[PDB]
């Protein structure tokens, strides 16, 4: 039993809700919140920009030190950093950004990072300003993640389409 509330159950391990991931995180304080990161951990917009704003830019400060030490992530890769005031940890995951021409096949690799964590609060990878088809992102999530994932979808309209079209 966990404190995630109001989620629809899609499969044995995947749950979904219309919610602002920032407000979900502040309420639940999950062990892991997933960020929709880019390889430079530049948290400018979309989920990343919102999550960082909620940390008063502390996420960006920590991220800049990470990059200065380690260099950029790989597309499809991840790193674990602090969750600041939102969660114990933040798993920064880089899905392919279609608007940069990146290989959508890398979306499966991106979701594989979730399997290193027993429970996560997450957005759909490569959705929103990353330009991928969210119905496809949900499908890849369900077919790749085996650990317990709680998906927050910001747009109420989009949520209804994902539920109604879920096979
Ligand atoms: O729901 C949305 O408006 C957009 C468009 C498609 C998916 N999302 S999102 O970019 O992942 C996103 C951005 C900021 C906050 C949250 C989400 N999801 S949940 N909270």
UniProtKB/Swiss-Prot annotation:
Documented effect of changing residue 31 to A: In strain: Mu/B.1.621
Activity regulation comment: Inhibited in vitro by GRL-0617.
Subcellular location: Host endoplasmic reticulum membrane
Catalytic activity: Thiol-dependent hydrolysis of ester, thioester, amide, peptide and isopeptide bonds formed by the C-terminal Gly of ubiquitin (a 76-residue protein attached to proteins as an intracellular targeting signal)
Function, as annotated: Responsible for the cleavages located at the N-terminus of the replicase polyprotein. Participates together with nsp4 in the assembly of virally-induced cytoplasmic double-membrane vesicles necessary for viral replication. Antagonizes innate immune induction of type I interferon by blocking the phosphorylation, dimerization and subsequent nuclear translocation of host IRF3. Also prevents host NF-kappa-B signaling. In addition, PL-PRO possesses a deubiquitinating/deISGylating activity and processes both 'Lys-48'- and 'Lys-63'-linked polyubiquitin chains from cellular substrates.
Subunit structure: May form homohexamers. Interacts with N protein.
Stated name of the protein: Papain-like protease nsp3
Native species: Severe acute respiratory syndrome coronavirus 2
Span covered, complete protein: 1025 to 1191 of 7096
């Amino acid at each position: 039993v966990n404190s995630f509330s109001g989620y629809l159950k899609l499969t044995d391990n995947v749950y979904i809700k219309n919610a602002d991931i920032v407000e979900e995180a502040k309420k639940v304080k999950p062990t892991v919140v997933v960020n929709a990161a880019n390889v430079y951990l530049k948290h400018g917009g979309g989920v990343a920009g919102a999550l960082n704003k909620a940390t008063n830019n502390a996420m960006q400060v920590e991220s800049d030190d990470y990059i200065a030490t380690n260099g950029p992530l790989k597309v499809g890769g991840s790193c674990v950093l602090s969750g600041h005031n939102l969660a114990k940890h933040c798993l920064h995951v880089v899905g392919p950004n279609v608007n940069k021409g990146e290989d959508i096949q890398l979306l499966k690799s991106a979701y594989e990072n979730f399997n290193q964590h027993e429970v996560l609060l997450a957005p759909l990878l490569s959705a929103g300003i990353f330009g991928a088809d969210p119905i496809h992102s949900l499908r890849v999530c369900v077919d790749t993640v085996r650990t317990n994932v709680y998906l927050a979808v910001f747009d109420k309209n989009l949520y209804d389409k994902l539920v109604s079209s879920f096979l």
